[PDB]
Amino acid sequence: CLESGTSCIPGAQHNCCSGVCVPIVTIFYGVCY
């Protein structure tokens, strides 16, 4: 799973450990909760 702080893409298949992808710059660049 993508760990906390690791970049994910909000709207795409975000396999984060919490599952939550937090948009930082935009919805094109976020980080997992």
- The number of domains in the chain is 1
Token pair in block for residue 18: 């919490």
Q: Do residues 3 and 13 lie in contact, with contact meaning Cβ atoms separated by under 8 Å?
A: no
Token pair in block for residue 23: 């948009």
Give the count of beta carbons closer than 10 Å to the beta carbon of residue 17: 12
In Å, how far are 11, 16 from 24, measured between CA atoms?
Answer: 13, 15
> What residues make up the domain containing 16?
1-33
Which strand ranges, in their side-by-side order, compose the sheet holding 21-26?
Answer: 7-8, 29-32, 21-26
